[PDB]
């Protein structure tokens, strides 16, 4: 299938004393495999998946060094943004950065991305051609001018199209027993009275990987969104995910409704009906 490698960085400034709090996480598809927390004791990139533990000390020395460089960049960014926006040294502010690459079924480059946010809103993003920048406001336009002159986008495109993709293949091969397996949802249907006239049908999807999935309700073979509730896909905590979709129906009419489940791990969509 398709795969992606993505990195998420968050820096939260602390007024009053000291350095900002910085956290970094790295993902292949929906699996976290590395992390860094400036508040933890090791002060190293630490593993979070078994297939990355096998990498040697040269890797962990490089990753740690680069992630501390990232943290120092965000430290400076927070200082400069406070200046651009004329804000006081009293408030607490956030910078977030995310970048990565997707490969297709053939494992060749499909797409790369790199975006930045300040206080939770778009600041500057790399366009889909990896050649220019999207700037949300005038502060960010000044950054756009710094970066076009320093040719950051060019430097960034080499990584996304090249290095990012190479290591993604490497990770996919070593974690192949996990990263290259699909886990089909385990599905069932439960029933809960909500009065003397109504009943809830809840259609469950458990223990599936990856997290993309679609659950839809039908009545007499036609789509139904009225009186349906669909919760956000949630992590089970063991690496897999969960989801459910519910419909309120009139007691005695449960049989008219069917739940339909689509997932990469299923050769065909599943169909579920209530059974007494």
């Amino acid at each position: 299938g398709s795969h992606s490698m993505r990195y998420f960085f968050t820096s939260v400034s602390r007024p009053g004393r000291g350095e900002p709090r910085f956290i970094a996480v790295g993902y292949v598809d929906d699996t976290q495999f590395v992390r860094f927390d400036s508040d933890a004791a090791s002060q190293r990139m630490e593993p979070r998946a078994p297939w990355i533990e096998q990498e040697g000390p040269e890797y962990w020395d490089g990753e740690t060094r680069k992630v501390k460089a990232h943290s120092q960049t965000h430290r400076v960014d927070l200082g400069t943004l406070r200046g651009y926006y004329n804000q006081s040294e009293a408030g607490s502010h956030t910078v977030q950065r995310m970048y990565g690459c997707d490969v297709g079924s053939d494992w060749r480059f499909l797409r790369g991305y790199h975006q930045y946010a300040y206080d939770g809103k778009d600041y500057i993003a790399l366009k889909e051609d990896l050649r220019s920048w999207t700037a949300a406001d005038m502060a960010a336009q000044t950054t756009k001018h710094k970066w076009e002159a320093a040719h950051v986008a060019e430097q960034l495109r080499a990584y996304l199209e090249g290095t990012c993709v190479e290591w993604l293949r490497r990770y996919l091969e070593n974690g192949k027993e996990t990263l290259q397996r699909t886990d089909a949802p385990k599905t069932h249907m439960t029933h809960h009275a909500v009065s003397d006239h109504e009943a809830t049908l809840r259609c469950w999807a458990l223990s599936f990987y990856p997290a993309e999935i679609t659950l839809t309700w039908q009545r007499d073979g036609e789509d139904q969104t009225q009186d349906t509730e669909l919760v956000e896909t949630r992590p089970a905590g063991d690496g897999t995910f969960q989801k459910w979709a519910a419909v309120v129906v009139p007691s005695g009419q449960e049989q008219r409704y069917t739940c339909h489940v689509q997932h990469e791990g299923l050769p065909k969509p599943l169909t579920l009906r209530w059974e007494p």
């Binding site: 990195y7 970094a24 790295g26 490089g62 990753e63 680069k66 992630v67 460089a69 990232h70 960049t73 400076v76 960014d77 400069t80 943004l81 651009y84 970048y99 930045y116 600041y123 500057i124 950054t143 710094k146 970066w147 320093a150 950051v152 430097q155 960034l156 990584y159 290095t163 990012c164 290591w167």
Partner: peptide
């Protein structure tokens, strides 16, 4: 493998 090199300022 995170980006290697001089990550410029904003």
């Amino acid at each position: 493998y995170i980006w290697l090199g001089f990550i410029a300022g904003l």
